[PDB]
Design a protein around this ligand. Structure first.
Ligand SMILES: *[C@@H]1O[C@H](CO)[C@@H](O[C@@H]2O[C@H](CO)[C@@H](O[C@@H]3O[C@H](CO)[C@@H](O)[C@H](O)[C@@H]3O)[C@H](O)[C@H]2NC(C)=O)[C@H](O)[C@H]1NC(C)=O
Ligand SMILES: *[C@@H]1O[C@H](CO)[C@@H](O[C@@H]2O[C@H](CO)[C@@H](O)[C@H](O)[C@H]2NC(C)=O)[C@H](O)[C@H]1NC(C)=O
Ligand SMILES: *[C@@H]1O[C@H](CO)[C@@H](O[C@@H]2O[C@H](CO)[C@@H](O)[C@H](O)[C@H]2NC(C)=O)[C@H](O)[C@H]1NC(C)=O
Ligand SMILES: OC[C@H]1O[C@@](CO)(O[C@H]2O[C@H](CO)[C@@H](O)[C@H](O)[C@H]2O)[C@@H](O)[C@@H]1O
Ligand SMILES: OC[C@H]1O[C@@](CO)(O[C@H]2O[C@H](CO)[C@@H](O)[C@H](O)[C@H]2O)[C@@H](O)[C@@H]1O
Ligand SMILES: *[C@@H]1O[C@H](CO)[C@@H](O)[C@H](O)[C@H]1NC(C)=O
Ligand SMILES: *[C@@H]1O[C@H](CO)[C@@H](O)[C@H](O)[C@H]1NC(C)=O
Ligand SMILES: *[C@@H]1O[C@H](CO)[C@@H](O)[C@H](O)[C@H]1NC(C)=O
Ligand SMILES: *[C@@H]1O[C@H](CO)[C@@H](O)[C@H](O)[C@H]1NC(C)=O
Ligand SMILES: *[C@@H]1O[C@H](CO)[C@@H](O)[C@H](O)[C@H]1NC(C)=O
Ligand SMILES: *[C@@H]1O[C@H](CO)[C@@H](O)[C@H](O)[C@H]1NC(C)=O
Ligand SMILES: *[C@@H]1O[C@H](CO)[C@@H](O)[C@H](O)[C@H]1NC(C)=O
Ligand SMILES: [Zn+2]
Lengths: 512, 512
């Protein structure tokens, strides 16, 4: 039952991360681009009747021309009964009408088919539905389900057209068997199981798989990347996304190695999905929370945002001094529709305890970004001082300032976040990990000096960090006290002489 | 250079975890049992000259008849020069004198050979040394090194006799190539490279591998388990140990699957090694710290303990409701030579906010264990109350009590620890993760009610937790304020009616 009396929006509703106006949101679904309308479509696991997961569960729907400003629509798909759910799935555009649902009056770029998990008591099946109006309303296929294996742990179909083998491909999870199942189909209705894939960090269950061709930077080559969500049992606690790099022939995915790697090593990036019908590269986003505490965080009358849309590539990067690995790179999608309210620019700054960088903006939108390239100098300092810190400070409210801290330690070659906020309490905060680290090799070397970069964006209750031009991504929510939100940024150190040179510093106040 | 002026031993030196009397300890080495003398041997990476890592670096040495009472000996092996180190390695007993070092005056069970990494500037090699006095003094082999591949990233040899292929086997890490190399030898001097193994979570580097037959519970069969340390780049930050289950023929290790699993999901369990010459089962221990902060924790005039000795088996356990996996099990070695100073024993207690469990012991050793079997009842409580907490409280000093918290949440089916202690500060505490969790399936079901077990031991500055009879292990150090150490244990809940029934509760104060 949503309490419309208490609205936390003013201080903790993100400006450029999608949130439903009210109710509960989890996994993003049916992500696609309408080439005719030039519209991005976001669907999502949606309970409008509470700020927690519940059935009946629907596909919510929003559209955007630029992946930052969203317009929320009426519910797109709903269950047959109150004790049922339209669980996760995906959308394809059936340009050549292989499904037989579309006539000449439906533009080929708008021949929209949803493939989703129908959840009923003791049964999960893969069902389809078609939209004749650009993805706003759907008709369920008469002969659903299209796949039934008599299981209650069988969900999250990601479907794509595979040109090379001239067929539809589904990757779907046999969740508690720890198997990604690869099915093939000529018409999206009649499916054949081609192979099973089992690898990486199993945790409790497999969920929301994905399989897509990702370009290698500065080349004409590409690799197939298999995405996989696990929850619970993440090594960081709760829910997390992992990936595998290799090749696909339409029947089997063959990884290049047997290594485990995570997509994002924050706590709050789960159920990642890619957009269908992108013409250049790979774009996707995730649900920006963690199953451990998502339904308890102090937001109202909604819970959950998505991450920003991110652009995915592969790059050879040093994982140690000697060895390079083909690694998943992600950078945020931030178009010119984002307004810069104010900015601080500094160059070649030798950081010390008497030379802090402090923003002095007139007001605050609660939306900021910081772009920093730094070099570690050859200075011996005591071990408590081998670091610098970016402080994100609230306004002073009732005599107190709340803040979160993003730092780098030169002795550990590791970034860290501390999202610990004194006095803010909510159920299951025992699982709300406060301190997270990311080890990185230098981005570059300036003679013998190690060079690193960091891009960060803060949007009222969520922070996204991208280290070394997207080599590592870390997504984390944070909850300041009632009425408090980000207002100013400081960069500080305790070193008396310079250990860090900030070659370039850009801190901007942004708005929609 | 160690200050003997300040000694923290009284409040934070463990009683039954080995610590050097003074200086720095990291990885355990040369672990073996002398069947003739009936003595367990522990060697360790040792810097006597500071409470941080430094060269010259030695093998320290201690012995025990029972794996809890340790006698520290003279340094066993030292480097040729001050800018060199005797890095990690292992010991075997050359019963049949394959090496030719041992005549009829040396009992077969005492034909002790150390295989270790010799660290010199820009070079790491595998060297051997032999002991004619039961492992107290060593003579380096005159034709060292026994393996040189012209690398400065080539270390941590674990050697064993393989009967099936009638040869010595060495597993060693080509650290920055992410390879465990398997070599073979008739005589411990002349080696042949047989295979390279690469899998699991790579992080920054491969270190301290092991390969051993682990018995399957209730069976005469076993599996080959490959152990692997990575540091830095643990998904929990810093250093961690992982394992692989499969088969070995003397030349190649073949895992049964391609899954990644960690040995211990605490922050402070690294460089795990197994004892040689164990006749019943598999025994091992690790370094009980994390490279991120190990050299900064507030102990003096030593830093670091080992973990307890643990007993390793394989058991088929539910990782989800549907599926069992052959899983590494570990339980602590705690013999009857440990005195029970006092204990609290309770049976069939329905836990509520008016019925807390509280120890009322006359004094404190700072050494306690708690053994609990609990059951989750069918009670609906508000989301903030779906849990119970074990509080480990210091004595009141300067008007405050320091505490650490171990809990279970029935909504998340997860254990958690909070080792956050306010007002205790030390360098690199930004990496000192305070909140850790572990998801488990129930140990058993009583009709429809979920049953779980938990064994924990607190030894002044270290806590070891074993969930569901050793299904999951979690090791963490903790640092209370100056003079404070564990004094009393409480078990509490906020539920007004019973959510948890404690079938069995045993809390003991222990001593040497
Ligand atoms: C680690 O745990 C294992 C159990 O998984 C323990 O192994 C058991 O150890 C006892 C000896 O302590 C063995 O009993 C012996 O059996 C032989 C004949 O089978 C008999 O001749 C001896 O008199 C003795 O009773 C027992 O068989 C063995 N169990 C298994 C399954 O191997 C081991 O002791 C534990 N180690 C420590 C130090 O706690
Ligand atoms: C995501 O990144 C890719 C490049 O890595 C961008 O792709 C380029 O897009 C332009 C048109 O916008 C094309 O003319 C180029 O040929 C593309 N390059 C490659 C190598 O494909 C893509 O535009 C990015 N998308 C977003 C939304 O940022
Ligand atoms: C962060 O800063 C870097 C500059 O250091 C930006 O990268 C440059 O982007 C421009 C386009 O705006 C390119 O022409 C340059 O070649 C890039 N140079 C470098 C140094 O990368 C980057 O776009 C910034 N990131 C943001 C705003 O998110
Ligand atoms: O809304 C269901 C949708 O979410 C996912 C991924 O988060 O599964 C979540 O919800 C399920 C039902 O409560 C849980 O079984 C699952 O553990 C949880 O992650 C998708 O798998 C599913 O389609
Ligand atoms: O003492 C060296 C010994 O420790 C290990 C494992 O912890 O390596 C540690 O020390 C090395 C030298 O400082 C580092 O290169 C390494 O990263 C660190 O883990 C063993 O690998 C080594 O034999
Ligand atoms: C849930 O929300 C839907 C969509 O607005 C509404 O029509 C329905 O009555 C609600 N049902 C329950 C059981 O709350
Ligand atoms: C084509 O489909 C549309 C639905 O969009 C329907 O109204 C029309 O009658 C159909 N007939 C044609 C165009 O063949
Ligand atoms: C894939 O897994 C399913 C479910 O366990 C099984 O029925 C099927 O035979 C497997 N198929 C292949 C080709 O491995
Ligand atoms: C280091 O310790 C050893 C062994 O106790 C000692 O003999 C040596 O002099 C010390 N060296 C330095 C450099 O302090
Ligand atoms: C055996 O070795 C011992 C110890 O090194 C030595 O005292 C003795 O001379 C040796 N015996 C023979 C026959 O060489
Ligand atoms: C094993 O790795 C080593 C070192 O990288 C390499 O030279 C050797 O050829 C490899 N051997 C095999 C059998 O792969
Ligand atoms: C804990 O309790 C169980 C069941 O009573 C017992 O068998 C076990 O030995 C105990 N564990 C320890 C480490 O004392
Ligand atoms: Zn605090």
């Amino acid at each position: 039952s949503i309490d419309l009396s208490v609205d936390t929006s003013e201080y903790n509703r993100p400006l450029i991360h999608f949130t439903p106006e009210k109710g509960w949101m989890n996994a993003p679904n049916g992500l696609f681009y309408d080439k005719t309308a030039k519209l991005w479509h976001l669907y999502f696991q949606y309970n409008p009747n509470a700020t927690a997961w519940g059935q009946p569960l629907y596909w919510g729907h929003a559209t955007s021309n630029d992946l930052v400003h969203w317009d929320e629509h009426e519910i797109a798909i709903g269950p047959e009964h109150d004790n049922e759910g339209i669980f996760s799935g995906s959308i394809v555009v059936d340009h050549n009408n292989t499904s037989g649902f579309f006539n000449s009056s439906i533009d080929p770029n708008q021949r929209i088919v949803a493939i989703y998990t129908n959840n009923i008591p003791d049964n999960q099946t893969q069902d389809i539905a078609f939209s004749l109006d650009g993805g706003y309303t759907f008709t369920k296929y008469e002969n659903n389900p299209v796949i039934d294996v008599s299981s209650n742990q069988f969900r999250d179909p990601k479907v794509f057209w595979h040109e090379d083998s001239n067929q539809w491909i589904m990757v779907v999870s046999k969740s508690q068997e720890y198997k990604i199942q690869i099915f093939g189909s000529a018409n999206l209705k009649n499916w054949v199981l081609n192979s099973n894939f089992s690898s990486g960090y199993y945790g409790n269950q497999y969920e929301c798989p994905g399989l897509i061709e990702v370009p290698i930077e500065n080349s004409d080559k590409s690799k197939w990347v298999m995405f996989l969500a696990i929850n619970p049992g993440s090594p960081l606690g709760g829910s997390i996304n992992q990936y595998f790099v290799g090749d696909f022939d339409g029947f089997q995915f063959v990884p290049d190695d047997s290594q485990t790697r995570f997509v994002d090593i924050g706590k709050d990036f789960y159920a990642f999905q890619t957009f269908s019908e992108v013409e250049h590269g790979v774009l996707g986003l995730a649900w920006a929370s963690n199953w451990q505490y998502a339904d308890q965080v102090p937001t109202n009358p909604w819970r959950s945002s998505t991450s920003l849309a991110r652009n995915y590539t592969l790059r050879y990067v040093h994982t140690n001094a000697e060895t390079k690995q083909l690694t998943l790179i992600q950078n945020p999608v931030l178009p010119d529709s984002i307004n810069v309210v104010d900015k601080l620019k500094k160059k070649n700054v030798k950081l010390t305890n008497k030379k802090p960088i402090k923003t002095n903006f007139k007001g605050s939108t609660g939306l900021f970004d910081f772009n920093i390239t730094f070099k570690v100098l050859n200075l011996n300092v005591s071990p408590g001082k081998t670091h610098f810190d970016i402080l994100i400070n609230s306004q002073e409210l009732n005599s107190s300032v709340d803040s979160i801290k993003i730092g780098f330690d030169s002795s550990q070659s590791s970034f860290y976040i501390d999202r610990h906020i004194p006095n803010v309490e909510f159920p299951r905060k025992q699982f709300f990990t406060d301190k997270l680290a990311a080890y990185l090799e230098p981005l570059d070397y300036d003679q013998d000096l190690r060079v690193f970069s960091l891009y960060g964006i803060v949007d009222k209750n969520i922070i996204e960090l991208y280290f070394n031009d997207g080599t590592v991504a870390m997504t984390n929510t944070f909850f300041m006290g009632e009425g408090k939100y980000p207002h100013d940024i400081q960069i500080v150190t305790d070193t008396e002489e310079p250990l860090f040179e900030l070659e370039s510093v850009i801190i901007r106040e942004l708005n929609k």
